Design a protein around this ligand. Structure first.
Ligand SMILES: CO[C@H]1O[C@H](CO)[C@@H](O)[C@H](O)[C@@H]1S[C@H]1O[C@H](CO)[C@@H](O)[C@H](O)[C@@H]1O
Ligand SMILES: [Ca+2]
Length: 736
């Protein structure tokens, strides 16, 4: 069975600076591929490297970029042209249309209308094959563009081969960073020139300069095909040559089938049925986007063993390494999805995280490819602990624990988002104050407290001294330090203990990150009952949640000085202040379950799934963020969500399809049967798990893994009695 047919790599490409609809590019690649490949419509250096509304492609580009904000590294490109050998990125460009383009995850084709050239590419994990179909012409060429900021190129005509390295990056690399590439053509050069800062130099073989390039050329008959085998490495030219063997001598068709098989292997772990074509495309496009980041950053030595260039200390070292993800996004449900469906893959990643700590002194929070200053929190603790508690255990648990502890009492001197900014105040006062020059203080506080609960869980598990366990149990409860009875919301607190004024729940940024108090107050993943206890009890809590949907999207943007696209995105959706692209609020709707009204979660979750995700080029409602926003739909369409990674629980929502079958790596399968599901029947009337009544608002990891059948009776009427009982409630720390 094929699932790739439903994957649209263009979903999210119709995005602008002012309004994101995903901010993605078409990542042509193997799952978690070390090297991605994309058509490039944007000018070199532009974070918007492919936009759906662009008229012209100016190259096909090796990319590692996780987002337009973080931008790129290890990047070079190739572009076929006819006529005059031109290097200029604008002059060599070509009109195309999407009806002349075929984008799949394993294969990409496009007709370059101004050169009368067809380009096809099929990647492997670290390499890629190009096939250019040229017209009849005496002057056909291929441009290789190593990008600027210091690059290298060398044409080796005796081998029909061009090699080089690129260094242009966006920070977070060691001084010695290079991406080494090699390109072999199957047609001999008749024309050769290197390029040095815009200057065409015929028969000069070699450049070391700010912006190196090459152009090779030959004569072509009508429809003549020319193949270019390409690979790169972060280690050496010699390792690049080894990575080339991924291609063997396979042609385009062979590699397309191998890539298609690789994707079907992981896509096929979740089979959905009884939906419409929009829902199949959204679902699988989302699952595809959830299996890309963080990318492998390791390579195979002569003995088939993992080695990697360290983006942290620039040495080449043994073992696994991954990068290009920000945990502030991906701790919520992206990594949890791997612990559920692809634990053998997260095992590699977790080993990589150990190596990151050994090589840099800290666990990463945002990495691209080394430590990068972006977002907030210490959510690596969630990543690490959720995996461990789910049976994804690193070899060296002693080092893992020391790493976590180190992170609670240090901040990276160079990257303020690595480790814990403000730990000093936080350990002493139980919160990061509002008036000590540390922005996004409330957001850091709330996530630190959750992170500290995750540490608490591991400590209790590992049988650390009571003194230690107690300390993190206490810190876990630190979120209350920022709760304001007067507003019933979280609120910046000054260093002297007074709450900040004037206070406005509608002010974005400042105390919070990417949102306002209305977005961030719900960030008590590990103790929602505790929050409910603060907000006046469960009826008052539901009232507060209900009002998020009902309050006009007015905002105060003064902290940014402009309507950043996240704000705009909130306003246009007509869902009050519920901004689904806003990560901190993505679990919020599931909180209805904890206050005993799961029918409201069922209602709103279905609104979000039906309205905030579409299958087209403008498919998301905000930034996709390396799998987080897509994985949100994968879990939600299945009917549940890891509200609190670190527990074994998924909190119930409402399933989107009539049937879903999970194929676990342990060889068990789980069918989720909801035969009466429809556009109207989005309420859960009743549920059973392998014959037994199931009125609880959560499913357990260990139960799902035993496989079997969950049956869900769907209905157009809410069941006001189901799931209202204390024994029905998911985990809350204060009830432990
Ligand atoms: C500099 O760009 C960041 O901040 C501005 C506002 O200060 C935002 O408008 C912009 O979207 C990003 S935050 C953005 O990117 C992060 C890193 O890719 C990502 O983790 C976060 O979820 C968000 O999408
Ligand atoms: Ca985001």
């Amino acid at each position: 069975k094929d699932w790739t047919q439903y994957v649209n790599p263009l979903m999210g490409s119709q995005s602008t600076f002012e309004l994101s609809t995903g901010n993605t590019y078409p990542a042509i690649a193997r799952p978690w591929g070390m090297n991605f490949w994309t058509p490039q419509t944007g000018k070199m250096g532009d974070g918007w490297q492919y936009t759906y509304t662009a008229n012209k492609i100016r190259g096909f580009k090796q990319t590692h970029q996780p987002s337009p904000w973080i931008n790129d590294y290890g990047q070079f490109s190739i572009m076929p042209i006819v006529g005059q050998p031109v290097f200029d990125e604008e002059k060599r460009a070509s009109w195309f249309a999407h009806k002349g383009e075929v984008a799949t995850p394993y294969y990409y084709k496009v007709y370059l209308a101004e050169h009368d050239i067809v380009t096809e590419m099929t990647p492997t994990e670290r390499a890629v094959l190009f096939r250019f179909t040229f017209p009849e012409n005496d002057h056909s060429y291929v441009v290789v563009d190593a990008f600027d900021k210091g690059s290298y190129i060398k044409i080796i005509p005796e081998e029909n081969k061009i090699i080089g390295y690129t260094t242009r990056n966006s920070g977070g690399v060691p001084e010695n960073f290079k991406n080494y590439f090699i390109i072999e053509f199957d047609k001999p050069f008749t024309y050769k020139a290197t390029v040095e800062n815009g200057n065409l130099q015929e028969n000069v073989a070699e450049q070391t300069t700010d912006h190196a390039g090459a152009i090779i050329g030959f004569k072509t008959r009508k429809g003549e095909q020319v193949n270019a085998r390409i690979a790169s490495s972060f280690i050496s030219f010699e390792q690049a040559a080894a990575n080339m063997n991924e291609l063997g001598k396979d042609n385009i068709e062979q590699l397309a089938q191998k890539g298609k098989d690789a994707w079907n292997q992981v896509l096929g772990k979740i089979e959905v049925e009884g939906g419409n074509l929009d829902q199949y495309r959204t679902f699988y496009s989302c699952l595809y986007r959830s299996l890309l980041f963080p990318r492998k950053f390791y390579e195979l030595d002569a003995n088939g063993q993992p080695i990697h260039y360290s983006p942290y200390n620039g040495q080449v070292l043994p073992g696994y390494m991954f990068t290009d993800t920000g945990f502030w996004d991906t701790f919520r449900c992206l990594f949890p999805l791997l612990n559920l469906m692809y634990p053998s893959v997260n095992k590699e990643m977790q080993e990589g995280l150990i190596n990151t700590y050994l090589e840099s002194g800290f666990f990463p929070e945002w990495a691209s490819p080394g430590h990068r200053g972006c977002m907030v929190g210490n959510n690596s603790a969630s990543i690490l602990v959720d995996a461990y508690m789910k049976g994804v255990k690193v070899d060296d648990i002693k080092t893992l624990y020391e790493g976590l502890i180190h992170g609670t009492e240090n901040v990276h001197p160079e990257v303020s988002s690595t480790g814990r900014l403000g730990y000093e105040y936080y350990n002493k006062l139980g919160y990061v104050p509002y008036d000590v020059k540390i922005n996004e203080n409330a957001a850091r506080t709330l996530e630190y407290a959750y992170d500290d609960w995750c540490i608490y869980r591991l400590a209790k598990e590992l049988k650390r001294p009571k003194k230690e366990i107690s300390l993190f149990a206490k810190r876990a409860m630190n979120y209350k330090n920022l709760f304001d009875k007067e507003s019933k919301l979280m609120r910046g607190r000054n260093e002297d203990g007074t709450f900040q004024s004037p206070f406005s729940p509608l002010k974005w940024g400042d105390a919070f990150t990417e949102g306002n108090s209305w977005h961030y107050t719900w960030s008590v993943f590990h103790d929602p009952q505790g929050l409910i206890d603060l907000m006046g009890g469960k009826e008052m809590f539901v009232t507060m949640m209900d009002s998020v949907f009902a309050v006009p999207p007015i905002f105060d943007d003064s902290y940014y000085g402009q309507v950043i696209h996240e704000i705009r995105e909130m306003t246009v959706m007509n869902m009050g202040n519920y901004a689904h692209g806003n990560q901190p609020i993505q679990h919020m709707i599931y909180l209805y379950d904890y206050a005993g009204q799961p029918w409201k979660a069922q209602y709103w979750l279905r609104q979000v799934m039906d309205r905030m995700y579409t299958p087209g080029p403008d498919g998301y409602c905000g930034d996709e963020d390396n799998g987080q926003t897509s994985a949100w739909y994968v879990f939600s369409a299945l009917g549940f969500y890891p509200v609190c990674p670190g527990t074994d629980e998924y909190v119930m929502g409402t399933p989107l399809f009539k049937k879903a079958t999970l194929h676990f790596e342990n060889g068990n399968s789980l069918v989720i049967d909801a035969p009466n599901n429809s556009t109207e029947n989005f309420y859960i009337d009743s549920m059973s798990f392998n014959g037994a009544d199931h009125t609880k608002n959560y499913l357990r990891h260990e139960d799902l893994f035993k496989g079997g059948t969950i049956k869900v009776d769907m209905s157009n009427r809410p069941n006001l009695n189901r799931g209202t009982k204390e024994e029905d409630m998911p985990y809350s720390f204060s009830k432990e």
